[PDB]
Design a protein around this ligand. Structure first.
Ligand SMILES: [Zn+2]
Ligand SMILES: [Zn+2]
Ligand SMILES: [Zn+2]
Lengths: 300, 300
């Protein structure tokens, strides 16, 4: 296993008054070395209650972030929990929430969980192992659903949180969480981690993903804090690595398609050694991102 | 990638008059090293025409076994093609069959493909790479469907093939193909390969899988030849490796449960070094099979 979710230990990092990141203890070390880190989350606390960002893969990690949240919110109720995407490491813990907490997710997330949780769980067991808590998961879909391209505001008392679908960034029901007074943005999987981590273009939706992340970059103020899906907080300029990588792949694949190169020749040509460093580079880049983008842009 | 389906090259190996195995060229080498081999298939020919076993992952591999079948069947028509399970490496090639070929598969396979082929493809791209022909696959379900626990016979002229659902061994729609004259049985994934390859208990259904393989063992004559899903032919006694492994896991887990051991100490205790050899042992045994069996037997 590249990442053993039974070995992740969640810690609290205060970002501002009432605003916290939930981070694996080894996440800073792994991101610096280009490793693969566990899921990041967070907590925003207002005057009357709190909002949890991500509910984690399993009961163990859910219990850890719930314990952190009790200290962070000092007894105020958990009013909301947000899933940035359907991916189980961000959403499987929904089942362990109690009243009065309401789940916020995209309508696409709800549709997918409703129809396919069983095969999603099978996939997660295959890649992250059995006995990591996935088998126990039952479906708990959202209460408040953000439609495609939509946004909603949530008032926690004195703090109003923005939950925004900027467009396709990984799944098609990707939500960003924006806390405008501390200027903290949670991206979920849409931003994996700081450099040298790479985006995963699972469906080859390169053009959409680049446009979405450009909109996020243009939206954020220069002093914003970004909490990536699998990394520790970073500054707004940390996004440029991802924007440059996607723009380089887009320019290379478009040029390949204009010259009518085969897929194999395109993969051979777009080695892009200047973007290496990620421990998974030699899989994500030539065995997923480049061929998937080629196949997708073939039809555009 | 543990196995690159773009590098597999299928070969013909005759087992009897009109009975051929379709085996990757390196399957014998890989089985002897405890490696991970590509999908095995086969062909049975009577006076009326031929039956193809497994339609393979992609167009390249489908075309290879179709070319072999044209020589093996000496111009006779391809009357049938059988999918032993829904797994794409056994069935994705269905879409490329032409008239008059009829597909035989389980009703469970048809139901899974109808509801979840898109998810299945996404899983196969993640774990076997993009650009390996999975993206091109469209659904083509069976003409003749075997109900759960059912069986059907097919007369090819001078040869009658038995297609049998012996019970749950991998997916719940697992079909075995039995040719009583040559005494050849195809198992699909229900038997991965000869020793040291291990069963994959993806659902933890240990008792059911052991019972199914025991029934197959009791069914076969002592001079039967088995074509496993991912290996070269085995003798009937080669099943005892898999039967003994599953019985050992069941005894170990049952005794751990009765002593009130946690999942983590059951994994630590069930090292079972006498069943080593598989290059995937350190994953499939402690990270899939032992935990999944523990969780499946937990409430009996
Ligand atoms: Zn994630
Ligand atoms: Zn599905
Ligand atoms: Zn297989």
């Amino acid at each position: 296993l590249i990442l053993d979710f039974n070995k992740v230990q969640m810690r609290s990092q205060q970002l501002a008054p009432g605003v916290y990141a939930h981070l694996p203890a080894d996440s800073a070390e792994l991101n610096a070395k280009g490793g693969v880190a566990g899921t990041s989350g967070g907590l925003i606390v207002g005057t009357r209650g709190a909002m949890l960002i991500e509910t984690m893969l399993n009961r163990r990690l859910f219990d850890q972030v719930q314990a952190l949240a009790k200290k962070e919110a000092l007894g105020l109720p958990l009013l909301y929990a947000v899933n940035t995407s359907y991916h189980g490491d961000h959403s499987y813990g929904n089942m362990y929430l109690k009243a009065p907490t309401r789940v916020i997710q995209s309508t696409k997330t709800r549709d997918y969980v409703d129809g396919h949780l069983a095969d999603d769980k099978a996939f997660m067991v295959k890649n992250f192992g059995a006995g990591r808590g996935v088998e126990q998961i039952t479906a708990r879909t959202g209460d408040i659903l953000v439609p495609p391209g939509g946004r909603v505001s949530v008032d926690l008392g004195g703090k109003t949180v923005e939950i925004i679908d900027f467009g396709f960034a990984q799944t098609g029901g990707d939500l960003f969480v924006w806390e405008p007074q501390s200027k903290v943005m949670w991206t979920g999987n849409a931003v994996v981690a700081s450099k040298p981590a790479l985006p995963w273009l699972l469906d080859g939706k390169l053009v959409e993903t680049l446009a979405t992340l450009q909109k996020v970059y243009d939206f954020l103020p220069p002093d914003a804090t970004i909490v990536p899906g699998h990394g520790v907080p970073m500054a707004r300029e940390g996004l440029r690595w991802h924007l440059d990588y996607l723009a380089a792949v887009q320019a290379g694949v478009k040029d390949a398609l204009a010259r009518k190169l085969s897929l194999e020749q395109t993969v051979t040509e777009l080695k892009m050694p200047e973007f290496r460093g990620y421990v998974l580079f030699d899989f994500v880049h030539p065995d997923l991102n480049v061929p998937a983008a080629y196949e997708n842009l073939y039809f555009q």
